[PDB]
């Protein structure tokens with residue numbers, strides 16, 4: 001209702017002009033949101049709130065919770081089994097983590113894989129406007145977030161930290177990206193079924 005409209009507003013307002021020229025996610029300025037489904041998985045929520053509490057206690061009664069986008073070819077697995085760092089790619093910009101973004105267009109670059117992979121399954125198009133894509137709008141506990149400006153391949157959060165904020169840099173990092181090294185620090189709150197729209 002008002003809950004889904006703010007999700008739809010956040011999905012549209014956070015689109016950016018990508019330094020890849022739309023190569024990975026596609027050519028678009030806006031989406032066509034088809035459905036917003038609220039994921040209600042109590043076992044995943046219990047895991048999330050438990051870790052959230054531990055984190056708050058190690059960061060001045062502050063979880064540093066953010067509402068962030070996640071784009072991955074594994075969204076249906078995530079909605080059932082939750083985020084899992086055991087599946088995290090080791091050679092990512094910030095290492096073996098679960099990457100999230102404030103800009104839905106960044107998460108959109110990863111729905112079919114790193115640099116959009118091949119593209120959509122049935123047409124093999126990264127800029128496909130026909131096939132329906134899926135993004136997750138997640139509750140993310142960042143806790144004590146470590147600000148890293150360059151590439152740093154780490155396996156776990158830096159000592160005393162609960163995440164990594166990959167802040168924007170000239171040579172080279174276009175937009176912010178939030179990385180957790182523990183799956184229990186994010187809850188797949190909303191499942192956005194959408195299509196990127198041709199300008």
Ligand SMILES: O=C(Nc1cccc2cccnc12)c1ccc(N2C(=O)[C@@H]3[C@@H]4CC[C@@H](C4)[C@@H]3C2=O)cc1
Pocket residue numbers: 071072074077078081082083084085087088089092097098099100110113114183
């Ligand atoms: O929890 C995740 N997967 C799964 C969760 C439950 C079950 C699963 C079963 C099978 C496979 N996966 C599963 C998950 C972890 C890490 C990443 N991940 C990456 O592999 C890299 C590239 C892709 C997005 C950006 C760049 C980054 C990232 O966030 C995506 C998803």
Ligand SMILES: NC(=O)c1cccc(N)c1
Pocket residue numbers: 069070071072093099100101106107108110176177178
């Ligand atoms: N997979 C994603 O949604 C994502 C978010 C931020 C940064 C990166 N690299 C990926």
Ligand SMILES: [Zn+2]
Pocket residue numbers: 120121122123124125128129130131
């Ligand atoms: Zn397609």
